[PDB]
């Protein structure tokens, strides 16, 4: 039954029980139900007025954290004879590349959220003169649409695309991307194939991809070269979450799939998730006095 829960539940005092027909510590796991045995029914308890809040484990709190989603270092220089991000990069936006955010989102099957995007930019002089206050353009391009192929390309005029101009000196750039799936929730996992033929990608519904982030330096190249690193942070907000999942246990291999190998030995090995102890009778951190 649905109810408003702001604090953990109280304990009532309980007394001696000796009743035929009533076995609250016995259960049937086979039904799929978790045991309903209360502590009052298992031991003799006191009255506890529990005032412990539950708000930090709200799904909103658990997922409205700015987490790193993209980190691109690129050279800011004259690029006449390079082979590589020539004063700009494109990034197909995904939540799969950095495993702390990925595992948290993969606790759920479906997520609906707005995405507050924060763009941190840092500069280093190539191996000193000072750090320039460069202007950057981050342009949101939808998935599969035409992205710029040059720093100076006329695609950056951005007639309808959202673009954000921002410094290095100023506070990171910040915008909110709305929940933009064509469905009512993103599919965190997708047991299916994106195309009507059979060559399409498994596990990737492109309905859940936000877009392309096209980031350039607006400035013409300086006579010396710089290395510019752009960090992108996503914070989900106004979150609804459905159908919780077993957490990822083995290390991630790819951003494209749930493929697994495991570590060489326990912990988090394919044959052994938990590290070993000597026997089932061995107490690993036994207090000995």
């Amino acid at each position: 039954i649905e109810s408003i829960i702001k604090t953990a539940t109280d304990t009532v005092k309980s007394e001696i029980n000796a009743e035929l027909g009533v076995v609250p510590s016995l259960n049937a796991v086979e039904t799929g139900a978790t045991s309903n045995t209360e502590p009052e029914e298992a031991i003799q308890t006191r009255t506890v007025i529990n005032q412990h809040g539950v708000s930090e484990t709200l799904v909103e709190n658990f997922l409205s954290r700015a987490a790193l989603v993209s980190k691109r270092s690129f050279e800011y220089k004259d690029h006449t004879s390079s082979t590589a991000d020539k004063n700009f990069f494109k990034w197909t936006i995904n939540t799969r590349s950095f495993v702390q955010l990925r595992r948290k989102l993969e606790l759920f099957t479906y997520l609906r959220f707005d995405a507050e995007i924060t763009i941190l930019t840092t500069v280093a002089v190539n191996g000193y003169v000072g750090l320039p206050d460069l202007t950057l353009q981050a342009m949101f391009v939808p998935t599969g649409a035409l992205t710029p192929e040059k720093q100076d390309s006329f695609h950056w005029q951005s007639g309808s695309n959202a673009s954000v101009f921002f410094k290095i000196s100023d506070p990171p750039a910040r915008i909110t991307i709305p929940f933009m799936c064509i469905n009512s929730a993103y599919s965190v996992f997708y047991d299916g194939f994106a195309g009507f033929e059979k060559n399409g990608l498994y596990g990737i519904n492109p309905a859940d991809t936000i877009g392309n982030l096209c980031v350039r330096i607006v400035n013409e190249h300086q006579p010396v070269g710089f290395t510019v690193t752009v960090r992108v942070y996503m914070k989900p907000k106004h979150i609804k979450a459905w159908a919780p999942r077993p957490p990822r246990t083995l290390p991630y291999m790819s951003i494209a799939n749930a493929n697994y190998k495991g570590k060489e030995r326990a912990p988090n090995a394919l044959s052994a998730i938990i590290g070993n102890r000597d026997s089932v009778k061995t107490m690993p951190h036994n207090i000995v006095n």
Partner: protein, 99 residues
């Protein structure tokens, strides 16, 4: 607004905006098909609905195709205009399409 259904070589300019229909001597024949891909280049792209929609990424709702026969008063005929929901190949025989 006009679809460019006759988007073929040997079709020049305004010729692309009409489909020629001839008397046949075999029954149940295919006359033309129309891809419903607005995003790639097809007969729907340079339409009012096509051009405005390509300023957007997502779309929903019904379309309508209207076909004006421009033969003579004395010309007679019947056509069947079929929309096939996706999943398979485009129907090439009349007995498949009008399912």
């Amino acid at each position: 607004s006009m679809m460019e259904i006759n988007n073929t070589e040997s079709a020049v300019g305004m010729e692309r905006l009409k489909v020629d229909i001839s008397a046949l001597t075999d029954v149940d024949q295919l006359l033309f098909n129309i891809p419903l891909d607005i995003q790639l280049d097809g007969p729907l792209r340079n339409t009012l609905v096509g051009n405005i929609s390509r300023y957007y990424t997502h779309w929903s709702g019904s379309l309508e195709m209207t076909f004006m026969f421009c033969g003579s008063f004395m010309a007679a005929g019947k056509l069947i205009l079929c929309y096939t929901p996706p999943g398979g190949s485009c129907p090439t025989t009349r007995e498949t399409a009008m399912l």
